[PDB]
């Protein structure tokens, strides 16, 4: 089946710094969906090819890169990626914020 691969599941990121979370997958942008979320809150919503953004460059390489800037204590929490090109799978990731 279609499955998501993560390089790691726990990020430890300094306050005020930047962080790039990754959800890799095997590889049409129009067909591809990518989602990033937090508990009862949505960061990204990507269906029709369009301080937090995505790297559309990596999508050609089967990689969903969530780039956040100026990390804040409330960016701390569990993130969840969901992606699909036909088949679909989801991964969960934890982020903690240092000082």
């Amino acid at each position, epitope marked *: *089946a*279609f499955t998501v691969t993560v390089p790691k599941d726990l990020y430890v990121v300094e306050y005020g710094s930047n962080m790039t979370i990754e959800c890799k997958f095997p590889v*049409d942008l*129009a*067909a591809l*969906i990518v*989602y*990033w*979320e*937090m*508990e*009862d*809150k*949505n*960061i990204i*919503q990507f*269906v029709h090819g369009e301080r937090a953004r995505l790297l559309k460059d990596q999508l050609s390489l089967g990689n969903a890169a969530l780039q956040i800037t100026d990390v804040k204590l409330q960016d701390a929490g569990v993130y*969840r990626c*969901m992606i*699909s*090109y*036909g*088949g*679909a*799978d*989801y991964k*969960r990731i934890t982020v903690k914020v240092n000082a």
Partner: antibody
Amino acid sequence: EVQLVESGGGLVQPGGSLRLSCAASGFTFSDSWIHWVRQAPGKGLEWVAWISPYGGSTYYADSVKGRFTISADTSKNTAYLQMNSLRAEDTAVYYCARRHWPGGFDYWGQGTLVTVSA
Amino acid sequence: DIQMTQSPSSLSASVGDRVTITCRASQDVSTAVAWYQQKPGKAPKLLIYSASFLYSGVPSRFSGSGSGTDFTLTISSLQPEDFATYYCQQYLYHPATFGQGTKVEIKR
């Protein structure tokens, strides 16, 4: 015993509104992906919306966008579909349905009939 | 969106013979299609996913094949309880779209 029990079907007047419930169990709902597929009597199937309950990230059909709003409660563990400004065209049986990840929608709801008429 | 097209729209076949329900797509998909079985008053039940893979607990007589535009659900030995309306469905492009149906009456 994965079950998606729905409710809220019945008579509505055009312009009126209706809230449909889709209560889930037998699987992790936070990690699930819930859709909605309607079917007027005699006609085929029509996808209308989906949601990711973990974040509540939604996506609607051009037919229903700006009217139907799907929400979810990962705690109480049930989805919702607030249909507003209804029309006779929207008269159909609405099915709740969770996504089979490898493909398709595996587990469906028992379906409820929403009737739009004065 | 994307159109799915089942042929025939209706069919009558006796018990024991091979049915063959075609479903074509307006856009050159690849492999991302399912097959369901909606019988009257009840919700559709999944049969095939990803064109050529059988779902858990579905009878072996139901088959799947096709890649791109053209696929087909195939029952090897039809049987009274197989009376239903069958659907195809593509799920790589979204909105996810269905066919129109393919009612199968049993010929007795």
